[PDB]
């Protein structure tokens, strides 16, 4: 299962999330707030046009599916700050005959806010092992994706959870490589910010 990209929405607006895979199995939607647990929204079994909602989400969520494109949708209406969360889809089983919640997509980050989208400022952190990094400052909303050398440098990476200060997020990422390999073998951080349609690469060069 694969989900649509991160969303920013205004208070009062609607959004429609997608989940691409439905002849036998259903689709469940699940909400998770940062650092909290899991809440079930509802299910659709497109085969038999069957839906069932958590009564808590009855007035919030509408589940539909396009059988031809094997895509399920969840429309969330009358959006509020409390709707800000990660939304997952997962497969729904059939009684004792199948697995249940057995394949989950990566999730979609939904932020409900009046604040404007702001791309990140990416600043290089340069000085047997050497540590480099990138400081990702002043972006809104979540998330950002940080890679090093487009994902070819993955050992020795630490990317930290963002913190929110004066309505803007900041995070840092470090990478540690053998000292003999930098700057001779280049090290570049790549910061993708889906909500602003922006990706920034910063090559780390000696000060």
């Amino acid at each position: 299962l694969q989900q649509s990209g991160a969303e920013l929405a205004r208070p009062g607006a609607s959004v429609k999330l997608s989940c691409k895979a439905l002849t036998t199995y259903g689709i469940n939607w699940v909400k998770q707030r940062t650092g909290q647990g899991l809440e079930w929204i509802g299910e659709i079994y497109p085969r038999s046009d069957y839906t069932y909602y958590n009564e808590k989400f009855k007035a919030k969520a509408t589940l539909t599916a396009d059988k031809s494109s094997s895509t399920a949708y969840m429309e969330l209406r009358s959006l509020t700050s409390e709707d800000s969360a990660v939304y997952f889809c997962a497969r729904g089983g059939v009684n004792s005959y199948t697995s249940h919640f057995d394949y989950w997509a990566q999730g979609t980050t939904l932020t409900v806010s009046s604040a404007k989208t702001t791309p990140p400022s990416v600043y290089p952190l340069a000085p047997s092992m050497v540590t480099l990094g990138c400081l990702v400052k002043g972006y809104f909303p979540e998330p950002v994706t940080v890679t090093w050398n487009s994902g070819s440098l993955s050992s020795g990476v630490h990317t930290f959870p963002a913190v929110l200060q004066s309505d803007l997020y900041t995070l840092s990422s470090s990478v540690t490589v053998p000292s003999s390999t930098w700057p001779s073998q280049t090290v570049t951080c790549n910061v993708a910010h889906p909500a602003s349609s922006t990706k920034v690469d910063k090559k780390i060069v000696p000060r």
Partner: protein, 216 residues
Amino acid sequence: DIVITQDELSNPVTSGESVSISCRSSKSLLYKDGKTYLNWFLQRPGQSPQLLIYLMSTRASGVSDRFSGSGSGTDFTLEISRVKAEDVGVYYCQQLVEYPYTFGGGTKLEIKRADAAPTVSIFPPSSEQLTSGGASVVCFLNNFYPKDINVKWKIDGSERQNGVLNSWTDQDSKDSTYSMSSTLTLTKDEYERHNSYTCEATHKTSTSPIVKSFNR
């Protein structure tokens, strides 16, 4: 609605020992087909939950045979044989016998390893940042164990708390360490009025604080 309650673990757990995670329900999860509608998941940081066990005791495709489910009625256990470094994360149980489906609050698992001193690296504000009137001094405290650590900043020898923001990782599933970022954010005006910037880590692996410094 059925309420699902999980118990915490006595963390950290010891590698190679068996671990039992408890899940209790306010109502029976037995259905008229003779199956008990309880699932178990593992969630790693930044990832979606992964199914481990469905219908109380069926192991999911691709899951280690170290994981098994047991229980009856309102009382359930996920049993982990021979716990390993890769088992760290948050374990959830879920009931599907009645609408609405409900989850437990999660049980985090952490594992003991050998003590490891932090690798400490300090970075002054970039040329690039100083142009926008900001000055962030970044310190990484990487790959340490145990998680107990205190970070202090000093400016010209005096302790600074205002403008410090800390962020840290959950336990690493490969090396069982923790890592932390500490960032002192100043205006450029205040940054350029001081010379010495120090980040100091207090950790049981060193009698003395582990210190990195620079002079503007």
